[PDB]
Symmetry: C4
């Protein structure tokens, strides 16, 4: 007899059920509480990846009503500088910045708080690690009002641990990333739809929102992640290759590409075995057109489910479980 | 814990069980009640699509014992004209015409009723939308005897809503269309076999028939949709590319093709994000040969299940659930 | 709610469980009762197909300890002649011959019985059809000692019907054939492993053996069909393309091929829509080498399961159910 | 009704659950008890295959903290010589050697014990065969202290049989090998994750460790096999093509390859039908780099699950069951 805790579902395992609706897709309210104090106009966070979010992308997404997360794969001074560029920009834009859970990050957090960061992201592949929880407790004691997102977890016990450590928001995702090889390398992972619903159920009545991070391929996946209980989603692949993302555009056969790699790739690493792949992603153009298309998809879902707000989608919308023949 | 209402099955998930039979495939009765007043000789409806049904196809299918649905992607006057061409044609052929649920369709319904339409199709991607139900209630009050089909729904609550609004027949199908991207864009959908059986169970004892719309690839799918409880099926892909369908025949490498696109495709649309693809379908030839082949398949099923009539197939025939290995 | 009788399994859904064994693969007894009076040395029957069994193949398989079934796609006189060639051949070989269930087959049965046929196969795509059962009852009354195999069925009720009609053996298989399109055309079919076990359970205590017909791709499938309860298997694809099979060998790119088609293919038919495909199968060489390889596989299974006889394999060997990941 | 003992899971069916952790991947203890008297530094055994383990590979793996198994596809004198080369080498390296269960192996066991073998592997495709169990009982009586591994089994009854016969360790694996065709040829097999957990549950409280043999493709599979209860894993494919493995390196299109075949392949055999394939595997380079990468994967798992030792991973780590959509 094997120690199987439960069956766990991914995005492709389920579909949302259409319901009675007075909701017009164009009248749908996409605003969401990222934390008890931070409200975003769209439920979109950009990944803290060296091929996804630097100041230029963080600015564009904030303009669309989301929030960007400056990656930790640069010097403390260079990151605080990226935070200042987003913060100093006209329009009163909000920004986030990622920090490691390792020793010698107290200095980085200090520089980011001074640079005006709205939300500190304690960025770990294992949020339930005691060293991540200690770092959170240390940051919360020093900065009692700082908005902190901690992750990543994929269990109810993991979400509770982060909430007890002082997290303002909990990030969910162990193995779902499009560039992730954690599942194959370590054998560990939790299918995202179950991971999100478990974390949300654990955090019921706490006012601590859940972020569904990784595995979002289509706008239907955004809707599913929210109906599973996530207040917002974090995307890497969806925003990689856009004009606003870091790095230069490459020309291969005549088609335009941009780099996209996991933060656990050999390339991004330069002592652990890699948990991410390095690849090319087709050039997507301007972030504005991508967000318009993806949010439109979500809007159309809200019309089909009769959910006029993110909160209604999170708590009212129902799913049906489908087979492999259902999927194809 | 996720809000999973139930498991939902598609055509590939099931197979019909052979049973004791005195039914010869050639003696099988294919007639069905589309509504309490309209009886078709074959259980086949053509899709209200701009690449499937105009007067020429509607005439050919009516001649085979089915019914065509003139699409709403043309002016009010041009549609009433298409209705008159089918109606005025010799042989006393029946015709249907699709109308949108939006404002400024009262004028279209008036012109179609005057042009002699036998069945008005209130054509929506979301039949459970309050604005669709209101339009149905408005049409039923003005025309107490007009045959109205409303859709699309995929739940028991959705079928009941349409029946209460005054529908003569309920159309089922949320996401099963061969050209549909609703499932990927919105994340909403119900596998067709479950959607049909739920709607039929809801409408038991009402005399309001269910139309299984979308996803029919083979004649076996027609049989499955009927045994799931549908009185008839609606097909797009199956009749696209036929000589009688609208548009011109294209030559690519030496092979003959015709256009086939969703009514929610960018092309068909010209404010929502697209929910349909634009594609080429191989030229199928004359509609008569397709119907003979597809109905022959259904006839052979009726012989194997011991169901001599559509009503027997709808209520007696049993299924077995199969795995993915069952499918392949 | 859908009328789902049960879940049904195919060969790929299961695996046999290894067990304590005193059985050496080389000492395994492959003999089986085809009927209460006919005992075969190997549990192998060749398909009654115009691309599989004529006198030459029927002779070779009988020599290996199996039995061939001369197909009904030839004149009454020409079939009786094929029966005489196998019967008159030295060695006291047993032969079978297939007859249709249609009117004007009384003459064919008379000629086959006179020609010395050991087993009459009443060959139908639907054994549960009243016209098949009547034909069996008519043959049993006229020939009280004639060995009759009737089929095909795939249910417990279907197996009982054939046994009550007077069948000496029941043939199982609705939709499993490698060249079969019945499932796609009609939507009817029962996954073979469940179909066989249902028929065997129905016929428990009757002494009427079950033949698993269709879908056997590998020697492991033979073992699975027998452990599901079949006393023997019927193969088409496995023996198609052999030197002994009818038709000439074709040369395509340099590789040798032979024709293999369903008896319900357009080609084999020349009033029903086709339920079979027409294809080329690679030349397999001599039947002797194929049987040695396939029976060796079965022998090895008998060693792994601790089943020294066909009867032990049929009644003792256990299965495990596997997922799609189990299969690949 | 089919004799289905249970549902059985393979590596791809499950994922390990992340948990609270004070474990740093670099501080993780990989040591394991292969037997009550033999402790390995890494839980890795090399396959007793003629394309995987001879003295050179056995030396390299022992140096990494594992143990190699010299294959039985060579003369008694030539195998004892291979055992002496590993044993006589500097560093006090441990070695294993495989023997068949057939008659005329008493001579081979005598020569291997004299040559200084640390662990005798009674190597069979069917550990539950009475002739394998007798050979074990004969060896245990003659050598009361000799470390004996017997296999392969895949059931609780099979593991108990080997433990009762006197085995120091039980090897599990019926059909999971990357080069195995037993499942297709015989129809027998047990998905590895269930096979391992069943054998471990059977052997609870006996101090007799289980070896998970076959099917390990990635480092995540090692972790899964251990959490299923295996004390160690046996790998063929993972070490085939390495510089230390037997045979010469071949050049095909410009890429370097090495031979990899099942011990039941036609080639390795030269009276049974083959149960293995013959193939080329890409040249992997030095064994040291492969082990560093694979153990790193395991180390990372130990950090994610909060299991600081092999024993903790074997008994504390939990799984989630995933769908086919979960897998892809
Ligand atoms: C190589 C890998 N790289 C990454 C980097 C970013 C990631 N971001 C998200 C996820 C989600 O599965 C995994 C990630 C893996 C990684 O950090 N492994 C890893 C494995 C086990 C432990 Cl205990 C730790 N402790 C927390 C430092 C790290
Ligand atoms: C773009 C799309 N296009 C279509 C067009 C024809 C269709 N026909 C059938 C189906 C069935 O899923 C979907 C279809 C989508 C479409 O209408 N989306 C859509 C999504 C949500 C709502 Cl609330 C509405 N309200 C009813 C106007 C429309
Ligand atoms: C076209 C087809 N052809 C065949 C021919 C050989 C077959 N042999 C076996 C099987 C097993 O599914 C199907 C076969 C279909 C065929 O006979 N259909 C078919 C379908 C329904 C009925 Cl009621 C009948 N009645 C018995 C004459 C025949
Ligand atoms: C041809 C085959 N070859 C091998 C060789 C190595 C293997 N090693 C492991 C496994 C695990 O399924 C299968 C293997 C098959 C093989 O031994 N078959 C086989 C089948 C049934 C029995 Cl009763 C026996 N008795 C034990 C001698 C052998
Ligand atoms: O190398 C890596 N391994 C595993 N997960 C990663 C890696 N790098 C980033 N991630 C995660 O993958 C997410 C992006 O997933 P995507 O949106 O599916 O591409 C990020 O937000 C991280 O949570
Ligand atoms: O763009 C679209 N999106 C979704 N469904 C569509 C679209 N256009 C038409 N449909 C549906 O798809 C059906 C045709 O499906 P088919 O027979 O599987 O090709 C139509 O009768 C409509 O119900
Ligand atoms: O056209 C056909 N349709 C369906 N089944 C067929 C047809 N012709 C033969 N069969 C069946 O298929 C079996 C051969 O299956 P195979 O061994 O999997 O190739 C025959 O013994 C018949 O029972
Ligand atoms: O021909 C064969 N048939 C079946 N299993 C085999 C054969 N040769 C070796 N094996 C098994 O396959 C294992 C290697 O599996 P791998 O690590 O998945 O490649 C060996 O340790 C044996 O247990």
């Amino acid at each position: 007899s094997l120690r199987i805790a439960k069956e766990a579902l991914t995005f492709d395992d389920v579909l949302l059920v259409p319901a009675h609706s007075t909701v017009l897709p164009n009248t749908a309210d996409l605003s969401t509480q990222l934390t008890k104090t931070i409200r975003l106009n769209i439920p979109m966070l950009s990944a803290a990846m060296d091929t996804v979010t630097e100041a230029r992308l963080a600015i564009a997404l904030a303009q669309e009503g989301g929030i960007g997360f400056i990656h930790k794969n640069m010097s403390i001074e260079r990151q605080a500088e990226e935070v200042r560029r987003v913060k100093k920009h006209s329009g009163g834009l909000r920004v986030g910045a990622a920090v490691g859970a390792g020793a010698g990050n107290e200095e980085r957090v200090d520089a980011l708080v001074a640079a005006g960061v709205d939300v500190l992201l304690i960025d770990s592949s294992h949020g339930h690690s005691e060293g991540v929880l200690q770092r959170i407790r240390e940051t919360r004691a020093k900065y009692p009002d700082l908005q902190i997102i901690g992750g990543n977890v994929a269990t109810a016990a993991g979400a509770r641990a982060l909430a007890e450590a002082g997290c303002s928001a909990v990030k969910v995702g162990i193995g779902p990333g499009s560039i992730c090889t954690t599942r194959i390398v370590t054998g560990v992972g939790v299918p995202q739809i179950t991971a999100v619903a478990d974390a949300v159920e654990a955090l019921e009545g706490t006012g601590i929102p859940v972020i569904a991070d990784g595995g979002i391929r289509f706008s239907g996946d955004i809707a599913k992640a929210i109906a599973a209980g996530a207040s917002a989603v974090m995307v890497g692949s969806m925003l990689a290759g856009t004009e606003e993302s870091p790095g230069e555009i490459e020309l291969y056969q005549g088609r335009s590409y941009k780099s996209y790699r996991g933060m656990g790739s050999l390339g991004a690493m330069s002592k652990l075995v890699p948990e991410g792949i390095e690849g090319r992603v087709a050039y997507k153009g301007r972030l504005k057109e991508i967000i318009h298309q993806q949010m439109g998809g979500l809007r159309s879902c809200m019309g089909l489910t009769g959910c006029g707000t993110i909160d209604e989608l999170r708590t009212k919308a129902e799913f049906v479980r489908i087979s492999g023949a259902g999927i194809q």
